[PDB]
Amino acid sequence: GLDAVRKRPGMYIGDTDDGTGLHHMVFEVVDNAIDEALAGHCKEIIVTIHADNSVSVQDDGRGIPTGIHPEEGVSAAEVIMTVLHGVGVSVVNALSQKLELVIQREGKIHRQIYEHGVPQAPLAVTGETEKTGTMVRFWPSLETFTNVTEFEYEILAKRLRELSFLNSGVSIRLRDKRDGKEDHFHYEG
Ligand SMILES: CSc1nc(Cl)cc(Cl)n1
């Protein structure tokens, strides 16, 4: 359960004081965006540090499934976001004061807001779209993360570059809206 993640965050995300756990939050979501099933023949991932110190990861993959999970009684996307079972977005969700989820799948835009891993409403259709993919934007909880509270572009940049070489064909963009720095990592060897 998510309550166990909030009680002992160190266990699930790593060190919550030296900044390493804070940045693992980002990498955990990125890994899911990389591991996502392709929608077309390529994948693009866009990592954005927003000017309110939130991070969003978006991909152009298939989209997290939105249909009602027959056994759980809520959208499959909600199950993924709220259940423990390379640890999962549910952990990131658990340790985020807010998380926004936008899914584009089956011609429809779906949106859901969480607070400390608790959904504020059911996953809802907000409009129409010709695109597909997932967008997770999260604001880390400062009840969890102490001392180092701010994301560091360079740490993100260095890691995504390393990943780039391991994931040929995948376009990885990094954008910092605080000062306008950006990078593009795209290996095709
Ligand atoms: C784009 S962020 C992301 N996160 C998850 Cl949990 C799955 C997928 Cl398909 N993408």
Curated annotation (Swiss-Prot):
Residues of the full protein shown: 15 to 220 of 804
Record's subunit section: Heterotetramer, composed of two GyrA and two GyrB chains. In the heterotetramer, GyrA contains the active site tyrosine that forms a transient covalent intermediate with the DNA, while GyrB binds cofactors and catalyzes ATP hydrolysis.
Gene: gyrB
Protein name: DNA gyrase subunit B
Any one annotated GO CC term: DNA topoisomerase type II (double strand cut, ATP-hydrolyzing) complex
Signal peptide: none
Documented effect of changing residue 28 to A: No supercoiling or DNA-dependent ATPase activity, 25% fluoroquinolone-induced DNA cleavage, 50% ATP-independent DNA relaxation, binds ATP normally, does not complement the N4177 ts mutant
Keyword hit for Signal: no
Any one biological process term the GO annotation gives: DNA topological change
